Design a protein around this ligand. Structure first.
Ligand code: MYR
Length: 216
């Protein structure tokens, strides 16, 4: 089977670890979530800060962490699942009072030759906050501290924050930032945290995050 939706389609009901083999790829183990809307591949999960997410490009390309805990599936693995297909990207956030916010966007995801860019239509970039975006849409490369795509020549967004992310701006989101349990006092600290600006604010550190994907 090529992904979690294909496992769902042949009748798999249980969420957990499963072997898939996307086309052109060796087999590997993924976290599948089986829902009423088919199978979803978990590509990122964070809940307790046990796993260090401040990692360079090759770790973000290959994947890291604990498949039974916090992890990053890995951009190369994620792109072998999406191919060049339109995909649903689910983003689930938890704040410190147990409130959850469930978001979903249609995206395309490019290969490494695009630096694993997120490709958004103008309406979807509108959903995320972009106000002026041509009909050709928006393309946001992935960045890590050793491979940052900020065009400002003296500005490295990933190195200034933490982790790897599609830093369209350096102020929209970062679910791969540093895990914080409470109020940090050090100048320029909560800026490095796990945040999604339009939900709880630029400086609110989220308690838990899950990102999932489903091609088509
Ligand atoms: C689903 C992950 C989204 C990754 C970030 C791409 C968002 C494109 C930029 C959105 C507009 C930025 C506006 C802002 O900084 O508040």
């Amino acid at each position: 089977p090529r992904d979690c939706q294909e496992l769902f389609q042949v009748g798999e009901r249980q969420s957990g670890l499963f072997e898939i083999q996307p086309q052109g790829s060796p087999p590997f183990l993924v976290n599948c979530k089986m829902t009423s809307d088919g199978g979803w591949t978990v590509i990122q999960r964070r809940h307790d800060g046990s796993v260090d997410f401040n990692r360079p490009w090759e770790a973000y390309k290959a994947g890291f962490g604990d498949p039974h805990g916090e992890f990053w599936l890995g951009l190369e693995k994620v792109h072998s699942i999406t191919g060049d297909r339109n995909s649903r990207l689910a983003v689930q956030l938890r704040d410190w009072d147990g409130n959850a916010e469930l978001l979903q966007f249609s995206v395309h995801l490019g290969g490494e030759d695009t630096a694993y860019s997120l490709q958004l239509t103008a309406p979807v970039a509108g959903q995320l906050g972009a106000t002026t975006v041509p009909p050709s849409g928006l393309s946001v490369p992935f960045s890590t501290w050793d491979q940052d795509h900020d065009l400002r020549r003296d500005k490295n967004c990933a190195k200034s924050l933490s982790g790897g992310w599609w830093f369209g701006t350096c102020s929209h989101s970062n679910l791969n930032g540093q895990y914080f349990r409470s109020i940090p006092q050090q100048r320029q600290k909560l800026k490095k945290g796990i945040f999604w600006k339009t939900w709880r604010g630029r400086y609110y550190p989220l308690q838990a995050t899950t990102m999932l994907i489903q091609p088509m």
